[PDB]
Amino acid sequence: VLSEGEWQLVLHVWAKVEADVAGHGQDILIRLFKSHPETLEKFDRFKHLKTEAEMKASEDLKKHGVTVLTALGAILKKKGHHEAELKPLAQSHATKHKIPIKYLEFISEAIIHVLHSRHPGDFGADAQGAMNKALELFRKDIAAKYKELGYQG
Numbered sequence: 213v214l215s216e217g218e219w220q221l222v223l224h225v226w227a228k229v230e231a232d233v234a235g236h237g238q239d240i241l242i243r244l245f246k247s248h249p250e251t252l253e254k255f256d257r258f259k260h261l262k263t264e265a266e267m268k269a270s271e272d273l274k275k276h277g278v279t280v281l282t283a284l285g286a287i288l289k290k291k292g293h294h295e296a297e298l299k300p301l302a303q304s305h306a307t308k309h310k311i312p313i314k315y316l317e318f319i320s321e322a323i324i325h326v327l328h329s330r331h332p333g334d335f336g337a338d339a340q341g342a343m344n345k346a347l348e349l350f351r352k353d354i355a356a357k358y359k360e361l362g363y364q365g
């Protein structure tokens with residue numbers, strides 16, 4: 213469980229993310245794809261992109277980054293009471309998109325990296341720890357749904 217103080221740290225930095233959802237989303241997906249190239253292969257939509265400059269120029273990639281962060285923000289603002297939001301996401305990512313839990317760990321790392329780069333004054337070690345905890349909770353609950361369906365591992 214996160215404490216109320218930990219949730220406040222998470223949501224305070226998230227409010228800053230919301231000032232520029234598209235720019236954060238772009239940076240997070242590019243970091244994911246550059247650090248873990250296998251992840252790009254799961255996106256028929258994006259797997260033609262080779263270079264960072266190509267990724268930065270793609271409007272479609274920017275659009276999907278907004279989709280990702282909007283969905284995550286809705287989950288974080290539930291402060292753990294996220295069953296209705298999370299279940300549909302787990303179902304699509306397990307059974308349609310075929311995304312291993314490990315790739316959710318990778319995108320979590322990318323989120324932390326980008327938040328540190330763009331919000332240092334609101335993303336000190338205490339806020340980093342809280343955000344890590346929030347993303348662990350997200351992963352744990354997705355993993356339980358994956359296991360039900362036979363996709364944990």
Ligand code: HEM
Nearest residue numbers: 251254255257279280283284301304305309311315316319
């Ligand atoms: C913070 C974690 C993530 C969130 C909140 C998220 C959210 C979403 C949402 C809202 C959609 C559209 C609705 C749906 O299909 O469920 C989507 C689509 C998709 N996601 Fe994710 N996603 C996450 C992580 C990932 C990761 C790590 C991968 C791959 C490595 C991935 C691959 C896909 C694919 C392939 C689609 C379909 C894209 C298309 O062709 O339109 N997702 N995601």
